[PDB]
Every structure is written in structure tokens, then in C-alpha cells.
């Protein structure tokens, strides 16, 4: 069930050609034998590994490439917000404006709905209960 590398370290056989040098060894013996890991259109590759990721992920704010190849601050810092959204002090990630005072923390910092929103009220139709 396992494969061994030049450093006296062993990894599952399936991991050998997964596209990441799991052995971290001098010879890079797990990936060294594997074929060309091509990447499909509408996908992108990461500087440190032979991984293929959809372009939508490139500036979504999540470290999808383990090396941080996506979310490169030069290209991704271009974002803007509050055209139809709301902003939070936590790492940038903007949410539809109506969402902020709705009564559930849409942001990790919960800055979307402090007491400043104002105390809640509700109403019903005249023919209802």
C-alpha cells in the first residue's frame, strides 16, 4: 500500500503522482517519474505545485494554492465594494447590503450587525394574527 523515497520516507501509492512532491526529498522521487500534468482551459496553475485550479478561485480570497500563488496582491488587490454590497473590518469580503442588519453575523467580526443597526421590529397584514 505504500511507496518509499530516497530519504527513507514512505507515502501511499496513490500520492506518488498526485502532483505534489510529498517526499520532499533530494530526488523528488515521487513526482520525478510521473507524466506531464497538463492543465485544462478555464483553469490555472500554481507556482509551487503541479495543481490545476479554476480561474474563479484566483482572487476569491482563499489560499487555494498552498503557496499563496493565487490571491497575489499585485493582481487581486484591485477589488472594490459597496456598489450593491456592505464592508467589514475583517479581511475584505463584501456581502449584499440588505444582509448586514438582517440579524445573523454574515462577517467573522460580526461588524455587519452591531447594536448600531437599531433595535428590531416586525409587522403583519391587517387580516392576519
Amino acid at each position: 500500500t505504500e511507496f518509499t523515497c530516497s530519504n527513507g520516507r514512505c507515502i501511499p501509492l496513490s500520492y506518488v503522482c498526485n502532483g505534489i512532491n510529498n517526499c520532499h526529498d533530494n530526488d523528488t522521487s515521487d513526482e520525478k517519474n510521473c507524466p506531464p500534468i497538463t492543465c485544462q482551459p478555464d483553469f490555472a496553475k500554481c507556482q509551487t505545485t503541479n495543481i490545476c485550479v479554476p480561474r474563479a478561485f484566483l482572487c476569491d480570497g482563499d489560499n487555494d494554492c498552498g503557496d499563496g500563488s493565487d490571491e497575489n496582491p499585485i493582481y487581486c488587490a484591485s477589488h472594490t465594494c459597496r456598489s450593491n454590497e456592505f464592508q467589514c473590518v475583517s479581511p475584505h469580503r463584501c456581502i449584499p447590503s440588505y444582509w448586514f442588519c438582517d440579524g445573523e453575523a454574515d462577517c467573522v467580526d460580526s461588524s455587519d450587525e452591531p447594536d448600531t443597526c437599531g433595535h428590531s421590529l416586525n409587522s403583519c397584514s391587517a387580516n392576519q394574527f
Binding site: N63, D106, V108, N122
Partner: protein, 65 residues
Amino acid sequence: IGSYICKCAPGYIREPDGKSCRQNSNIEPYLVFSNRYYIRNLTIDGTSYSLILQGLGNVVALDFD
């Protein structure tokens, strides 16, 4: 390597929990269900309960378009 990430498809945004997703559309999703004589409308936010139709004979199945 050493962790996982969760992704919400287009039209969905991700909650602080990381594991959960919420829907981006403003219109409230609602539930429609039918008894023998009634078709009823209930909102997932729990704020509203209303009637679609009454007096039908036996409403055994519903679908929408």
C-alpha cells in the same frame, strides 16, 4: 496540504463557520406543502404562514415552474 477549504457555488456566499453557505438572492425562499383540502405557503425564515388554495378535493402532489 494539512487542511481543507470549503467552496460555495455561484449564487452562494460562505458564512464565518466556513463549513456553511448562504444564498445570495434577495427573494425569500419559501415552502409549499399540501394537505387533503389545502395548499399552504410557509417561509423558511419562519416569519410567514399563508394559504395558496382551499377547498380542493385531495391535493396529493405539487410541482412549480
